[PDB]
Symmetry: C2
Subunit: 217 residues, 2 copies
């Protein structure tokens, strides 16, 4: 009878506030009855972000929210007497904050340096390079896809390596007969690694980091 | 008797599908009685996207949603006898789709030319340039801020203009002196304009146009 629904709310809502977000329905209900709300977000830190209209059962939010700060609130609603005795025992009101894409992919282990053998077979792992993302990992908003943007130098061949778009594993793609040194200038290679958002998708957010790769004897 | 409260779903959800997005509660009705959903999205183009469990009244979606394709669904839900005849007349089930920042700002008014008289004062509106954004202007996903990225040439000053972050207005910032022809080459400055999402915060997506500004006699 007290009855009402799990509210979803996008983070980073623009002003003004407060804004309606849901509505607790009762029915079987006296006159001079009052919806009262409580729990985390009302009267437990963070106090004061959610409000119910005591007549209409309109649940409203009073300010913008941050999913990577707080991802869920569990509130409790109830109706009351003219006095304050509960004429409709308390039920749970769940609020899920919806991920918005407001974090940029960023590498956090740098500087990045891996070594590899001069004359290695294809698919030999140089190193691993995973990026971090403060957004929801179960949404496109985290979900990373990796690419190599630049190789220096561009000899013997322009792209000697290739990264796992999924795992971020750098591996060798070039034979022993060129992937060597003998008459080499700098022992090493310089790779510009990009991690992008929304799993590839033309329109992601990016983070970079240049890996330094040393050819070994 | 059927209570069907508005359902929110974020676009670009990730599989596996189907995924539960809501629930229609009724009250006051026999057994064997079955829920039945209908409308565009169900049994009318674009068909096949939402289902309802005929016993529990759980509402589910079968695949990722695109807000820019469809932003709202107008559905109808009813309870029927094993027969087929309504026993709990129809109600509306409104489904809304939460915007996710997946469209990049772009300048669709190529090309951009303005004019400004040689020896103008600080403040002269030369022109305005505004970018379009396929996302929801009520959110931050649209909500663009403006910036001048580069300017060629650089004489007299490397930055002769300023652009208003919100309004997109290009104003002159160079004297009745350091803003004059004759001492020059061709009538023109070329600027790179950037529009940024999320109200100009670093997590914004960006589009760019070139605005040619001619200096007049
Ligand atoms: Ca956040
Ligand atoms: Ca992200
Ligand atoms: Ca987020
Ligand atoms: Ca979309
Ligand atoms: Ca956008
Ligand atoms: Ca969108």
């Amino acid at each position: 009878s007290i009855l009402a629904t799990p509210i979803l709310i996008p983070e980073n809502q623009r002003p003004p506030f407060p804004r309606s977000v849901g509505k607790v329905i009762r029915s079987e209900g006296t006159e001079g009855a009052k919806f009262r709300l409580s729990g985390k977000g009302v009267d437990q830190d963070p106090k004061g972000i959610f409000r119910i209209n005591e007549i209409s059962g309109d649940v409203s939010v009073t300010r913008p929210l941050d999913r990577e700060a707080i991802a869920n609130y569990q509130l409790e609603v109830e109706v009351t007497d003219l006095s304050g005795k509960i004429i409709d025992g308390p039920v749970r009101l769940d609020i899920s904050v919806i991920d918005q894409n407001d974090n940029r992919p960023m590498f956090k282990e740098g500087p990045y340096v891996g070594h590899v053998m001069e004359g290695s077979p294809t698919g030999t792992t140089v190193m691993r390079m995973t990026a971090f993302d403060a957004d929801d990992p179960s949404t496109d908003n985290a979900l990373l896809r990796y690419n190599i943007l630049k190789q220096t130098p561009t000899k013997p061949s322009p792209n000697m390596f290739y990264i796992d778009p999924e795992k971020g594993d750098i591996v060798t793609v070039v034979s022993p007969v060129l992937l060597d040194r003998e008459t080499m200038e700098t022992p090493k290679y310089e790779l510009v690694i990009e991690a992008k958002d929304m799993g590839g998708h033309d329109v992601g957010l990016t983070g970079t980091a240049t890996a330094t790769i040393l050819i070994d004897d």
